[PDB]
């Protein structure tokens, strides 16, 4: 990484994160760094343990994509930009063949 | 309904209430004068 | 400062409490989960609320009562309220030779009477420490020799320092008069004052 | 000006009490793109038969208002199902199912004295169209009160083709994108991601990276 | 703990319910379909609600009552009550030798008295399992010799583990007070506490 | 399931309907234009609302009624309500040899009685089909030979399949008990239960 | 259609208005100027409102009444009513040979009886044109031989076309029900439907 | 136009004012500063509000009153209201030879009676100018020879042009009928009309 | 100005307070601390509030009263009132030769009569300084020969400048009307104005 | 609370009430299409 | 009035209600981090 | 997952009425950076001793809700003092005093 120190501290931290997941948390006193992961022993919540309210919301539009196109500064080239593009046949077999591309950098 | 008139009589409060949730992150509404 | 009652001032019989209302005010955050379990949370303090009602008052009775209330509002003192129904004398003797071990911050007083007190307090009576103005009600009492085990409804508002002395008789509520912001009394054409009510709150 | 049959222009002017029903026809969210199942629903108290299709009742609760300005914008509509059907609940909350590009057509039907559909649209000689678009969103709102009556509302979200305004559909000059390359077992093989099946053997943009 | 009543404390006949309101509280996700069909889903747990009204209480009886209530508020446990209208001892015998086969959920229940109990529990009477504190209500009864088939209005909260024993007499509701936050008592010039009432609510 | 009434259960005379309230619930969207023309729009269905009031209930009457209501709430059945004022027997005979032509979805039933039915239905009576639980009121009736022209208030909730059979006598409302979320009854010190009301709604 | 009343159905004397409220409903853009002047602009159309209250109705009379009302709700037409206090037949004769010259707008109206009518319509009586269903109210009358000059409170909704005939008797209000959405009837133990009332409202 | 009263129309004794309510409506912006000084601001005008109540009305009395009110609502005129209690004749003579100097815009009228008027007006009477319809009350009156110094409650709504003539007797309130948007009267079964109220406002 | 009353105008005995409500209005920043202590800060000025109720007023008495009130509303000055219950002339003499030493703030006040006054002002009586119009209330009195020590409920609004003279008799409250905006008077058929009342409020 | 649903049913009024306090100065919300 | 305090206690709802009317067209409030 | 002692996991599961107190410890706004004075406060009705520190009562009135998303943002909290203490008022409204970087632990 290169951190342009002329940027703000808040924006620099926000840019260091979102590159590996990450979420700075100030709860319970300390600063805790948490990244996305899968566990074989998660905490079991039944709906009867809740307060009775429940809101389900799935925004498949504007958030579900079938293919990704990314770019990066690759030292294989003379530190120029290289594009990584690939599709998924299963995700396009689903969604009735709609063409939706995820753009990343 | 008749809520439009009311909101039009309390616009500055709406602006402040909006800018108070954007300051949670680093966003703020004073960045529109550039554009 | 004592609120005028027909104990100290029997010449004004209209100053008696036509009806008292000892209100238990203990605000709590109560939440009912869908699984049928009701859960409570207590943070704030409990304060005894006293409401006094009065009959028609003659000019002299009202003059005395109003002079006392205005003296209260002038000096900013604390009205003391005496409830006759709580003045049953059970424990008699000296409360200076009794010792209370220190460090008691729960909802229970353990005291060694040292055999200097006759009688035993009854459950539901009024109990108070000598160094704090908060008034307690005895919910249970077990005596094993000279050491007494008095249980109180409000959790001890102070941590005993070992110098406190229990007070069983002559207990007064260090109240502060609420509803004094708009306090008035209408004088009828027959010369008697009507519509006088004292909403008092225990300001310890 | 959507023209209306003169026959309907008399009924809409003489009769005051109009019995209107909205016929909903949404595509089932399915895990794969195979086949095309449709659920037909109505807001009327009894089932309504239109073109031989029985629009069953008892599920739809409310429909939102369709608004269109003179500035390009997504046309959002919201119709709610009861949410206690327990057969519509599983379709929405099913795992591994996507409804990214499932359509929905809603008709505005007027019932006569005899219980039939009053013809309005001249081209079809049937009822008008209220909305036709795509399903983009959804949700269910459970509210269990510990004392009283609880409610549950399943709301489906709808919009037109421009729902994803941050969408860049273009043929970027690259072999990997033009032929829709994807690793299948150990090689980058062209797939159906190409805009045309004849793009799978097009090597036109092969040397575009070093040009 | 036990709520005082003339059965536990016969010396205080002023205690005792002047009127008891046993309400049924089953929250439900009711939905009124446009076609006329009403669909309701039961998710939240059901709980009996008890509203107790007291007659004119003399000062000593109220002292005992509020002492017990303040002990409740202090130690924070549950407050058991015994409704007397359901105290018709219609089933004699000792229920220890009565076995309830394990693995039973729902309204229906099967228990084998093994020729021990005498008396038939008619519909409308109360029922309670030995372990769980929930209180049910028998809606229908049918027996084939020793085996008894009982249908209860609330579904069995916990599945029988083969050791739960029936309790056909002396059933106590594990309740919690709902008037605690602001609970006042008025004293009349006649010398009685008037309008004392409780809004209880079964917990779990 | 039938609601207990003094037809089936005359031994409990307190179970009679002290006052019934047949509520016509047909929600409509009514808009009044400034030109003086009032316009209505109907989408939702019409459901008959029944409200039952009861007098003071003795322990046995209340026990029976409460057992029936708890059985209802347990099995989730449908309470059937019988109104005596609508039990005038006019049409008598067999309703199996009568034929109803299919495809009738309006607000009018045309049926060929085939001369098997004696008498004629009167306007304002209660009419119901044998294959649907919705209850209809006859608003008009014209007989031209054997074919009858019965006009009904609620628009036909079903399209006749040709197998439906008209029902004129013995009509019950397939109601579902509303206000059952908080259902209770206070027991007075004199032994009688008071404050019992059934708000029923026709859940077809 | 016609609302049943003792004139149409004398066999049902229970029908008939116990009390009728004929309200005047003219919406207006009223504005209270700061100088004390009140300015009001009439834009929305005026409509008479009729509130009918019925006496104790026996079951058969209520059956007829609600049968007619449900036929109204079914076929969706208008519901005509005849107020009996305005049924004083003060104008004899046949009004077919009475001509109203065309091109008349506003409150004033001129009609030529051609020496046919006998009787003078005094102020406060009703008036209605043959074609339009609006009902006016005569406020002043002045006749010069055969020609009659009548002033009506609501301005003529439609300009006379030279064929409209006066209707001085049997005037019916073309009304619409406003209690239809929730219309319930209670049956007493005495056997009568009590508190039946209608809130009608003239349409157009 | 004059409102019917038992002065002009004594044949209808039911048209008398059972109770009048002269309401002083002078809207002001009143602000109370924390320093105990209450401050007022007056911008809008003061208008006399008159409320009339009526007893049960026979058909002829109601017919006359309703005809007059409908004539008012037809021509859009101004109802004139006469209060008998303000009809004491003190100042008598000619009001045409009296001169009022011009330029008087305050709250005080200085007029030279020129010795043509006998008697003197009393404080609290009703006074009005001949060129404006607003009604004034005399709050003070000092006479120094022929020039009178009349003080009025409402600030002069007009600036005197020198041609105005004082009016002391026969003063009417140029009112406009409020609550006429929904104006009605229920006719009871005994033939008398009830529930008639006139809320009038001075629309100068 | 002076509010009319039987002392100023004995010819009008209808004037005079049927009932007077002298309310105390001290705004305060009261705060209820979580520990049970109640903290209140006095910032806003205190002001006596006077609610006057009049008996049945005959037309001439009401004419005088509302003439005076409208003169008040016109000239905009303050309206003085004299409460008669505090008119007990308990202090004889002329107070001009009574000096109040300068530089005194707070409730306490010291004044030297120089052997002029006869009579002791008991607690509850009124007190007012010559210059400032505020009205206080004596709460306690103590005299050592000629010097008098008086404690007043409201703190001295202005510090004594050495010239203020005591006013123990004829104390007038400088009040402002609070019912002016909508002040109506009803005239009965009996001939009296009923329910005339005033909500006064001391200004400054 | 249940205020979220309501506001979600009156969004355009909120937008207008916001843009009415930004027009006090030279800011306006139509300058977001560029970004 | 006392509406300011309330709105300051529900700011996020205001933000969402605003962003829900800008998404009608292609505008959104997440385009302020650039500026 | 902030781990909790199993002993507390029994109390939080068996007891229903929980008596909770929030112990506040804020640094005094001082004109200079010299020294570090602390005011210790509590929301409980009686003073609570923790690690020998007496958290005095009677001042704190309410505390806000601490919310944390998965997007970087300032974690705002708001606790209110009575405002009629007249000893906390002067500390806030004092002239020439800055509290730019004064901490607080709750």
From Swiss-Prot, chains B, J, K:
Transmembrane segments: none annotated. It is found in: Virion. It catalyses: Exolytic cleavage of the (1->4)-beta-glycosidic linkage between N-acetylmuramic acid (MurNAc) and N-acetylglucosamine (GlcNAc) residues in peptidoglycan, from either the reducing or the non-reducing ends of the peptidoglycan chains, with concomitant formation of a 1,6-anhydrobond in the MurNAc residue. Displays an exolysin activity that is probably involved in the fusion with the host membrane and in the host peptidoglycan digestion necessary for viral DNA entry into the host cell. This is Exolysin. It comes from Escherichia phage T5. The lineage of its organism: Viruses, Duplodnaviria, Heunggongvirae, Uroviricota, Caudoviricetes. The chain holds residues 1185 to 1219 of 1219 of the full protein.
Swiss-Prot record, chains C, E, F, G, H, I:
The keyword Thylakoid does not apply. Keywords: Late protein, Viral tail protein, Virion. InterPro entries: DTP-pb9_A-dom_C, DTP-pb9_A-dom_N, DTP-pb9_B-dom. It comes from the Viruses. One of its GO terms (cellular component) is virus tail. The keyword Iron does not apply. Its main location: virion. It holds the Pfam family DTP-pb9_A-dom_C. It is found in: Virion. Homohexamer. Interacts with baseplate tube protein p140 and baseplate hub protein pb3. Possesses OB-fold domains probably serving host adhesion properties. Forms the simplified baseplate, together with the p132 collar protein, the baseplate tube protein p140 and baseplate hub protein pb3. This is Distal tail protein pb9.
Swiss-Prot record, chain L:
The chain holds residues 1 to 106 of 949 of the full protein. Forms the simplified baseplate, together with the p132 collar protein, the baseplate tube protein p140 and distal tail protein pb9. Closes the tail tube and, upon infection, opens to form a channel thereby anchoring the tube to the outer membrane. These changes allow the tape measure protein pb2 to be expelled and phage DNA to be transferred to the host. Also forms the start of the central straight fiber, which is continued with the straight fiber protein pb4. It is found in: Virion. Homotrimer. Forms a pseudo-hexameric ring. Interacts with distal tail protein pb9 and straight fiber protein pb4. Induction: Expressed in the late phase of the viral replicative cycle. Ubiquitinated by the Bil antiviral defense system when this protein is expressed in E.coli MG1655 strain expressing the Bil system. Coiled coil: none annotated. This is Baseplate hub protein pb3.
